[PDB]
Each structure stands twice: as structure tokens, then as C-alpha cells.
Amino acid sequence: GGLPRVADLFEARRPKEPAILAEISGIVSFGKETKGKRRLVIT
DNA sequence: CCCCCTTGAAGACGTGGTTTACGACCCCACCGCAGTGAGTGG
Numbered sequence: 001g002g003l004p005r006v007a008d009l010f011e012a013r014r015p016k017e018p019a020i021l022a023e024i025s026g027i028v029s030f031g032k033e034t035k036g037k038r039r040l041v042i043t
Numbered sequence: 044c045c046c047c048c049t050t051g052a053a054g055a056c057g058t059g060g061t062t063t064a065c066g067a068c069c070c071c072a073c074c075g076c077a078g079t080g081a082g083t084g085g
Contacts, residue, residue, distance in 0.1 A: 013076090
């Protein structure tokens, strides 16, 4: 946007839909299951 | 125009006697934001 966008950028406001990132190198895999949880077990 | 009086009184400063007056005390049968907290359910 404009001024609100700059204000958001300088205040380090987290977006409502953060993108998942690779915390560490390794082969990804799917693990257990829950009501709304999809595991990301990584070797 | 220096000097000591006179001589009559005008005011000058208390002053606490005399006398008000103040102050107080007594009775009255929007805006989005983020941190907090329970509050679960598990």
C-alpha cells in the first residue's frame, strides 16, 4: 500500500499467513495425524 | 550675614488603657495494536 504499508514494515508486524520455511537441512517426511495437525518429521 | 536664644506650638511616636472585633470553642431531650488469562481439552 502506502503509508500504512511503510508503518507495518518498520514495526515488524507479522503477516496473518506466514510462509513455512525450512528450519534445517534434511529430507522431509510426513508423520503422525491429529484433528488439524500434519506432521513434518524431517530426517 | 556668622552666632547663641527664645516662647508658641505642630506634630511625632508610641501605647497599652480601653474597647471593639475576629475566630474558635462549647450545648441543644474510533483504532488497530499487543500482552493477559483462564480454559478448555488432551
